[PDB]
Every structure is written in structure tokens, then in C-alpha cells.
Amino acid sequence: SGFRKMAFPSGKVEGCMVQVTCGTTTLNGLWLDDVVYCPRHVICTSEDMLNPNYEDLLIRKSNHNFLVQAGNVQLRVIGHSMQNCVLKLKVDTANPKTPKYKFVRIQPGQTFSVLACYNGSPSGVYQCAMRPNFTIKGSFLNGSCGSVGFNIDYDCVSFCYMHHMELPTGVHAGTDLEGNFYGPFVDRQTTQAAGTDTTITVNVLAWLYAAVINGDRWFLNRFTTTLNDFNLVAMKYNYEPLTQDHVDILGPLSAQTGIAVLDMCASLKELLQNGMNGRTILGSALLEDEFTPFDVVRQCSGVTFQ
Amino acid sequence: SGFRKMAFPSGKVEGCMVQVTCGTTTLNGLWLDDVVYCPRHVICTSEDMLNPNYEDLLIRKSNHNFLVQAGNVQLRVIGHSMQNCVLKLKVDTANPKTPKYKFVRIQPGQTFSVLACYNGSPSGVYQCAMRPNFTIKGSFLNGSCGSVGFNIDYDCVSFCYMHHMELPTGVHAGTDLEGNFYGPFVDRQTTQAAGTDTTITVNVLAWLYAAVINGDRWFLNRFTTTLNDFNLVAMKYNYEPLTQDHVDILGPLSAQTGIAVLDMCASLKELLQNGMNGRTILGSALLEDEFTPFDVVRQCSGVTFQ
Ligand SMILES: *C(=N)[C@H](C[C@@H]1CCNC1=O)NC(=O)[C@@H]1[C@@H]2[C@H](CN1C(=O)[C@@H](NC(=O)C(F)(F)F)C(C)(C)C)C2(C)C
Numbered sequence: 265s266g267f268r269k270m271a272f273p274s275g276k277v278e279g280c281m282v283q284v285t286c287g288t289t290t291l292n293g294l295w296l297d298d299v300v301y302c303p304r305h306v307i308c309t310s311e312d313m314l315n316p317n318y319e320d321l322l323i324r325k326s327n328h329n330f331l332v333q334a335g336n337v338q339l340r341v342i343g344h345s346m347q348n349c350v351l352k353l354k355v356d357t358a359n360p361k362t363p364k365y366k367f368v369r370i371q372p373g374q375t376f377s378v379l380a381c382y383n384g385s386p387s388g389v390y391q392c393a394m395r396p397n398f399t400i401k402g403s404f405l406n407g408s409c410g411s412v413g414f415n416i417d418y419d420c421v422s423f424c425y426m427h428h429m430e431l432p433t434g435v436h437a438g439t440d441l442e443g444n445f446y447g448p449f450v451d452r453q454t455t456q457a458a459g460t461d462t463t464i465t466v467n468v469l470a471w472l473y474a475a476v477i478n479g480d481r482w483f484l485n486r487f488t489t490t491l492n493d494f495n496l497v498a499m500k501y502n503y504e505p506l507t508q509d510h511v512d513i514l515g516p517l518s519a520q521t522g523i524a525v526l527d528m529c530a531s532l533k534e535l536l537q538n539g540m541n542g543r544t545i546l547g548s549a550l551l552e553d554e555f556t557p558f559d560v561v562r563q564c565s566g567v568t569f570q
Numbered sequence: 571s572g573f574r575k576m577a578f579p580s581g582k583v584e585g586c587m588v589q590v591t592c593g594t595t596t597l598n599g600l601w602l603d604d605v606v607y608c609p610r611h612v613i614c615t616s617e618d619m620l621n622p623n624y625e626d627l628l629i630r631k632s633n634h635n636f637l638v639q640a641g642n643v644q645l646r647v648i649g650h651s652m653q654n655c656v657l658k659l660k661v662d663t664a665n666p667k668t669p670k671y672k673f674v675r676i677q678p679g680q681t682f683s684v685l686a687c688y689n690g691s692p693s694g695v696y697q698c699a700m701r702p703n704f705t706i707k708g709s710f711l712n713g714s715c716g717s718v719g720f721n722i723d724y725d726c727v728s729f730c731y732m733h734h735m736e737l738p739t740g741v742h743a744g745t746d747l748e749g750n751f752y753g754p755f756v757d758r759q760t761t762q763a764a765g766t767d768t769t770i771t772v773n774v775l776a777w778l779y780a781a782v783i784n785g786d787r788w789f790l791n792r793f794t795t796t797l798n799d800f801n802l803v804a805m806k807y808n809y810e811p812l813t814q815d816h817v818d819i820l821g822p823l824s825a826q827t828g829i830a831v832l833d834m835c836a837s838l839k840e841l842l843q844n845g846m847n848g849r850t851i852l853g854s855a856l857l858e859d860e861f862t863p864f865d866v867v868r869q870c871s872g873v874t875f876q
């Protein structure tokens with residue numbers, strides 16, 4: 265019944281976006297209750313950003329130095345603090361469209377939806393994955409910072425990402441909502457390299473399950489294997505180790521398609537050795553690693569929100 | 571700065587979704603002002619759907635036979651009519667979250683965002699294209715019908731699709747919001763075939779422009795060509811004819827990258843002849859045809875909504 269890179273619906277989060285201006289720098293903010301969270305480099309000028317001293321810049325700021333606009337309405341700031349690489353502006357108005365929400369810090373391999381924004385206005389929404397090198401393959405221009413990444417569980421928005429910077433290779437980096445970066449990056453304009461990226465094995469298998477459910481079954485073989493042996497052949501192709509926790513997490517997909525997890529591992533071994541020989545799987549000639557087990561289940565069983 | 575299959579933010583449309591039940595059939599509705607639009611096969615039973623007589627079924631229905639739920643709130647129906655394959659239920663309450671909206675009928679080649687819903691609740695959002703054979707490569711399960719496709723221009727939602735049925739090959743079919751199908755399909759459970767699908771040439775070129783902007787330039791050659799000659803080589807590969815209107819529509823991307831449209835056509839000719847020889851473009855080993863000129867411009871210049 266089809267299989268696509270699907271994102272969460274964005275309305276709950278659109279109701280939280282605002283514009284934060286400080287001097288001439290403008291970027292995005294998240295308004296939740298009476299607090300606005302945004303990247304702390306909003307207090308910089310251009311020339312500060314090469315090697316900035318944030319605490320020093322913040323001393324010279326008052327409440328009134330921050331311009332916070334929700335649509336046309338201006339939000340008076342009544343306090344400011346800095347928490348790691350994020351900035352919290354207390355405001356005089358609680359956001360009446362605040363959803364149930366929590367702040368989470370995802371693990372490498374987990375996915376989320378990004379609502380890319382400019383000037384506090386939503387431009388578009390797409391689904392990303394936290395790569396094992398702690399980067400994301402997103403799409404962002406100048407002024408995108410403060411755009412956020414999230415998951416929805418029924419009614420609760422789990423905010424897990426806030427965008428800060430783009431790295432030499434076209435990939436992106438940021439923080440959780442407490443302002444700690446993911447990976448070894450810092451918020452300054454200096455040379456930073458990513459680290460080598462490894463392929464998320466459990467997400468590939470999840471995608472192969474997605475393919476069977478959808479009738480694409482040519483890659484299934486009749487063989488099995490052991491976790492140990494599988495992991496030796498994967499290592500060579502820069503695939504992450506598959507833990508037993510991964511196997512257990514794949515149990516629901518295993519149960520529903522009646523294909524033991526270690527059979528699917530066998531099928532993947534073959535694909536890593538022999539290549540596809542010019543065939544596709546779900547429309548793709550490359551093995552895809554940006555869908556979690558949970559993503560496959562929600563899409564191929566039709567889970568909804570609110 | 572990255573390039574992804576990006577969808578419009580969905581909040582404006584989420585505020586319009588409702589659940590329509592009639593007998594035991596439940597599917598999705600669109601509530602705009604005081605009218606709910608949904609697929610007319612909500613009035614069927616299972617066994618009716620093999621060869622249904624819709625006008626006959628609707629005679630036997632009253633207002634009170636339709637259960638319309640917006641969240642927990644029930645909407646009293648105060649009238650019903652049928653317009654082609656869509657059904658309009660007048661209700662006693664106008665939807666206070668109705669956006670500025672219009673109903674449009676897109677052309678093959680145009681893209682839009684689908685908000686897949688079940689039981690009047692949003693499950694996820696993704697971007698599709700109206701294929702030249704008048705199908706879409708979507709992702710839908712039972713109960714998805716009435717989910718809608720749309721574009722946003724600043725503040726106005728242009729609704730262009732409503733989902734009705736899935737075709738033997740995993741692809742999907744539906745109507746505009748006046749209830750006319752796209753392509754030769756009808757709303758009955760009988761064998762229907764798609765027609766052969768052709769590749770949308772102008773969208774491919776747009777994607778190649780997207781690639782240059784993003785620094786991927788290996789496929790550019792030094793040669794030019796004529797529209798005429800180009801179109802002869804494309805025909806063989808089941809690529810649509812490139813009209814002069816297409817060339818003009820590509821003028822903004824041409825202007826910004828300083829690459830005449832007919833140079834890019836030359837570069838595409840080579841790719842259709844020689845293949846990629848194992849290289850990628852924007853991460854893909856296949857030429858991609860699901861981004862319009864307009865989509866590339868909005869994403870790679872950062873257009874926002876509201
Ligand atoms: C936030 N609004 C922008 C978003 C950027 C702009 C281009 N694409 C994006 O994702 N973030 C920044 O401009 C951050 C910000 C200063 C510099 N910066 C960068 O993203 C730069 N990157 C780096 O210096 C590097 F190489 F370390 F990654 C830039 C050269 C502009 C891509 C600060 C405070 C780090």
C-alpha cells in the first residue's frame with residue numbers, strides 16, 4: 265500500500281515558532297509556556313562568530329535588547345539566561361498554543377521530523393536521522409537556526425533537535441533543547457570535520473521488512489546465519505554492529521512478516537556481497553538506513569496523532 | 571546547504587480534518603466553513619463496492635445517517651448532496667479554523683503534499699507528484715480515503731487531491747475537490763490498469779539545477795543542443811517532450827546558476843545515453859523527477875508560509 269519518507273504533522277510545532285532579533289542578527293525561536301528557546305549565537309555580530317565569547321556578549325545585553333515577535337505581536341522579554349549553547353528568554357505572555365511537550369536527547373540511529381523555518385515562519389517539513397557521527401543530512405539556509413527537530417507520541421511533542429550550523433560537507437549540526445551539541449561540534453565559525461559515518465544496520469533491516477510487507481521479496485534467500493558471523497561481514501562494509509537489543513527491537517516486524525530476524529540478516533549479507541545487480545527495493549537502488557523499526561510499524565500499520 | 575523531499579507544513583490543513591461515519595464505513599472528511607467533503611463510497615457497504623449505484627444508495631440516506639466527528643465534538647448534518655465522486659455534508663457549525671483556501675485541479679507533473687489521515691486524525695505528511703498517467707506514488711492503508719493533497723501560497727491553501735483508491739501496482743488514484751477523478755479511474759472495486767508512465771523531463775532538469783546549486787557538478791558537459799534534437803533522444807527513454815513553456819519556466823534556475831537551459835539538456839542527454847557509471851547526484855543513483863522548478867526555488871531560496 266506504498267512506502268514513503270514520512271514526517272510527523274507539524275501543526276502543533278508551528279504554533280510554537282517565533283522570530284528572535286538581537287542587534288541585526290535574526291533567527292528562529294521556540295515559544296513554550298512563557299519561555300523562548302533559541303541558539304545563543306543570536307547575540308553575535310558577523311565578526312564575533314569566528315571566535316566568540318558568549319558570556320561576555322550576554323553581560324552587555326538587557327531584556328529590551330531582544331526583539332521577540334509572534335506573528336505581528338511583540339513579546340516583551342522579562343528575563344534572560346544561557347544554558348550551554350541555548351538561550352532562554354522569559355516572556356510576559358504564556359503561549360496559549362503550547363502543546364504537551366517534553367525535551368529529549370535522542371541516540372544516534374533515531375529519526376525525527378525537522379520543521380525548517382525562516383523569520384519565525386515555517387517553510388517546510390522533512391524527516392531526518394541522527395547519523396552515527398552525530399550529524400544530520402538536512403536542508404537549511406541562512407536564518408534557519410532555531411528550527412527544531414521533533415517526534416510526536418499521541419498528544420506529546422518530544423523536541424530533540426535545534427539547528428545551529430552547517431559543516432564543510434553539506435551536513436548539519438545542532439543541540440538538544442538543553443543546549444548540548446550532538447557530537448563534538450562547537451558554535452563557532454572555524455574548521456570542523458564530521459568523523460567517518462557508519463551505516464545504521466538495524467534501520468536497514470527495518471527497511472527490508474518494510475519492503476516485504478509491500479510485496480518486494482526478490483532479495484529473500486532460504487539461508488540463516490548467526491549474529492556473530494553476520495557482524496563480521498558487515499564490519500567490512502562500514503555497517504554498525506547489530507546488538508541483541510536491535511534483534512529484540514525488530515521482533516514486531518519479525519512476528520508480522522513471519523521472517524526470523526537472522527534470516528533477514530542472511531538476506532542482507534548477500535546484498536552486501538553481491539550488490540543488487542541492477543534491481544531496486546521500494547524504488548531505490550541503494551540500501552536505505554533512515555527508517556527506524558518504529559517508523560516502519562507506524563507507517564505500515566497507520567498510527568495517528570491526537 | 572542540503573536538498574530534501576520537503577513537504578508543506580500541515581497545521582492549516584490538520585485543523586480541517588474530521589471523521590465521517592455512515593453505517594459501518596468510516597473515512598476522513600475535510601471541514602471548510604459549514605461543509606464537509608468526503609469520498610462518496612462512504613455510503614457503501616463492502617459488497618456494494620464491487621459495482622455500486624451511488625445515486626440509489628444516497629436516496630435511502632437522511633442527514634442523521636451521517637456521523638461527523640470533529641475531535642470529540644459531533645457535527646449535526648443539515649443537508650447532503652453528491653458532486654461527481656465527492657459528497658458534501660452541510661453542517662450547523664462553521665469550522666473556526668478554516669484557512670483561506672481554494673480548490674484547484676493540478677496538471678500532470680505538478681507536486682503537492684499529502685496529509686495521510688486515519689479516523690480523522692493525521693498520521694503523517696509527505697510530498698507527491700501527479701504522474702503523467704494520472705496516478706501518485708503515495709502511502710495509504712484502509713481508512714485513509716478523504717486524506718487530501720495540497721499546496722500553500724503564503725496564506726492560501728490550494729487543495730488539489732482527495733484520496734479514493736489503490737491500483738494493482740501499489741500506486742494511488744483520486745479526485746480533485748469537485749469530485750472528478752484524475753485519469754480514467756472510477757470508484758468501484760474492479761480491475762483497473764494505470765497506463766504506461768513517462769518521466770517528467772522538466773522536473774529532472776529542475777533537479778539537476780538543484781544539484782549544481784548544491785555543489786554537485788560532475789555531470790555538466792561543455793556542449794549545447796537544440797530543443798528538437800534533445801527531444802528525439804529523450805523519446806527513446808520514455809521521457810516527456812520538453813515544450814518551450816518548460817524552457818521558460820526553467821528561466822529563473824537558468825539565470826541563477828548561469829547555465830543556459832539547453833546546456834543542461836545537453837548534460838541530460840549524456841546521462842540518458844551513458845548512464846551515471848556508478849556516481850550519485852544529490853545522494854541518488856537514479857535521476858529524480860518529483861521536484862518542480864517551483865519546488866527547487868522555494869527550497870534553495872527559503873520561501874515561507876504565513
Ligand atoms: C543559522 N541560522 C545558520 C545556518 C547555516 C547557514 C548555512 N546553512 C546553515 O545550516 N548557522 C550559522 O551560520 C552558523 C553559526 C556561525 C557560522 N555557522 C555556520 O553554520 C558555518 N559553519 C561553520 O563555520 C563550520 F564549518 F564550522 F561548520 C557556515 C560557514 C556559515 C556554514 C555559527 C555561530 C557557528
Ligand SMILES: *C(=N)[C@H](C[C@@H]1CCNC1=O)NC(=O)[C@@H]1[C@@H]2[C@H](CN1C(=O)[C@@H](NC(=O)C(F)(F)F)C(C)(C)C)C2(C)C
Nearest residue numbers: 611710711712713714715734735736737757758759760
Ligand atoms: C479508502 N479508504 C480506501 C483506501 C485504500 C485501501 C488500501 N489502500 C488504499 O489506498 N479505498 C478503497 O478501499 C477503494 C474503494 C473501494 C475499493 N478500493 C480500493 O482501493 C481497491 N482498489 C481497486 O479495486 C482497484 F484495483 F480498482 F484499484 C482495493 C482492492 C481495496 C485496493 C472503492 C470504492 C474503489
